[PDB]
Design a protein around this nucleic acid. Structure first.
Length: 87
DNA sequence: GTCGTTAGTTGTGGGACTAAAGGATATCGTGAACCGAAAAATTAGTGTAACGGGTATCCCACAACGCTAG
């Protein structure tokens, strides 16, 4: 049975994350490049966004919701770096 | 008819490009709210004066003779 990637993420199978990563990696990279200008920090934030999606995988309800989550989170990460004294 | 071989491309990638002086730049995008951390300021509490001998030092002044008789 070929379940959709939403149910693979819900099950607890790590290859699901490979699927969502390979699908939305470049979109999240573009989202980050829109808000910042440091590719290093953008890549770090993309990794954090996907890992935090995996951690909060017990909070998704819709197949599209996953995508929304990613975009949302990634944006706010960029936003937080406007306030960090270190950065 | 079919498979490995060799040479000559062909596309693609990595590496060079005097010497002297000088040598200034400008650098977006914003989400909230609470807790913890330490660095700083404000506040509360206790106090001497002369005396006895005896002796160490200081400043300050003066002395350190000359003659006659038993």
């Amino acid at each position: 049975m070929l379940y959709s990637d939403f149910e693979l993420l819900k099950i607890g199978d790590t290859s699901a994350l490979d699927h969502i990563h390979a699908k939305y990696f470049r979109s999240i990279l573009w989202i980050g490049r829109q808000w910042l200008n440091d590719d290093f920090l953008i890549e770090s934030l993309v990794q954090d966004t996907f890992l935090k999606l995996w951690v909060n995988r017990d909070k998704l309800e819709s197949p599209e919701h996953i995508f929304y989550f990613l975009r949302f989170v990634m944006k706010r990460e960029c936003i937080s770096y406007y306030r960090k004294p270190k950065y």
